């Protein structure tokens, strides 16, 4: 079964020998070179649309922690940008680091992130999220930045709940959450296409990143790091430096919504 993660021996440098498509065309995370960035007036403004969004849970899965929604129909959806189509939110999750000059999985200009937030939605033209990441459209990955300064009023919901989540395996219910809470001011962005950024790592991704990053507070992302990689009882493994590096842009064009 899986066992790749992100410890000494068996990180992102190792995923290759059971994920081939680690070393393919079109693998994310990458480096977003400002300057080479190419303005495109086609693209249009995003439309995210979470006023209907209802979450249910969150869940440590070993990687991370997740906050589902109900996407048994349209409720919160992303549409507009460089997308054609609906594609409805399935879950969010953070990737993050030991301190706070790491932990995005994205970079601008080379500088690392405290945090990334990434928003999963999925193309409803496929039917259901198993059969859309087989195609290469299939996912639209809304990706945020999280700097550390002032609190987000909204994320502090999120991190009262993980002391009742800390180990892998659990979860806990966590209705009427609103993830329009997690966003910044302007929805300018970069966009490519590319991949999910943990096994299986399928080529199935839009990504649309978020120019502006969320500032949290240090005591907010201090309490991510208190999470637990390994199950109850299990040796403790805190959950940190859970992302994977930038990888070869290759043959692809990152756009930007903005001049
Ligand atoms: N990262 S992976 O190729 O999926 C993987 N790494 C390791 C290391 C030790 C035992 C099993 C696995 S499975
Ligand atoms: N980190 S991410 O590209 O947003 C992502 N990776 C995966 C892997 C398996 C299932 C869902 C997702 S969402
Ligand atoms: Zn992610």
């Given at each position: 079964?899986?066992?790749?993660?992100?410890?000494?021996?068996?990180?992102?440098?190792?995923?290759?020998?059971?994920?081939?498509?680690?070393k393919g065309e079109r693998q994310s995370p990458v480096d977003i070179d400002t300057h080479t960035?190419?303005?495109?007036?086609?693209?249009?403004?995003?439309?995210?649309?979470?006023?209907?969004?209802?979450?249910?849970?969150?869940?440590?899965?070993?990687?991370?922690?997740?906050?589902?929604?109900?996407?048994?129909?349209?409720?919160?959806?992303?549409?507009?940008?460089?997308?054609?189509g609906t594609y409805?939110?399935?879950?969010?999750?953070?990737?993050?680091?030991?301190?706070?000059?790491?932990?995005?999985?994205?970079?601008?200009?080379?500088?690392?992130?405290?945090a990334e937030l990434h928003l999963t939605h999925w193309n409803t033209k496929y039917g259901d999220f198993g059969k859309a990441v087989q195609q290469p459209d299939g996912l639209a990955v809304l990706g945020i930045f999280l700097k550390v300064?002032?609190?987000?009023?909204?994320?502090?919901?999120?991190?009262?709940?993980?002391?009742?989540?800390?180990?892998?395996?659990?979860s806990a219910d966590f209705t009427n959450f609103d993830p329009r809470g997690l966003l910044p001011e302007s929805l300018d962005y970069w966009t490519?296409?590319?991949?999910?950024?943990?096994?299986?790592?399928?080529?199935?991704?839009?990504?649309?990143?978020?120019?502006?990053?969320?500032?949290?507070?240090?005591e907010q992302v201090l309490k991510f790091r208190k999470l637990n990689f390994n199950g109850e009882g299990e040796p403790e493994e805190l959950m940190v430096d859970n992302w994977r590096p930038a990888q070869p842009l290759k043959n692809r064009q990152i756009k930007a919504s903005f001049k």
């Open positions: 079964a899986h066992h790749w993660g992100y410890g000494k021996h068996n990180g992102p440098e190792h995923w290759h020998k059971d994920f081939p498509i680690a960035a190419k303005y495109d007036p086609s693209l249009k403004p995003l439309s995210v649309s979470y006023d209907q969004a209802t979450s249910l849970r969150i869940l440590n899965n070993g990687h991370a922690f997740q906050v589902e929604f109900d996407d048994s129909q349209d409720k919160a959806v992303l549409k507009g940008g460089p997308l054609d409805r939110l399935i879950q969010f999750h953070f990737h993050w680091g030991s301190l706070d000059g790491q932990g995005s999985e994205h970079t601008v200009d080379k500088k690392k992130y405290a300064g002032s609190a987000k009023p909204g994320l502090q919901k999120v991190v009262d709940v993980l002391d009742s989540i800390k180990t892998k395996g659990k490519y296409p590319g991949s999910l950024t943990t096994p299986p790592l399928l080529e199935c991704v839009t990504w649309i990143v978020l120019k502006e990053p969320i500032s949290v507070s240090s």
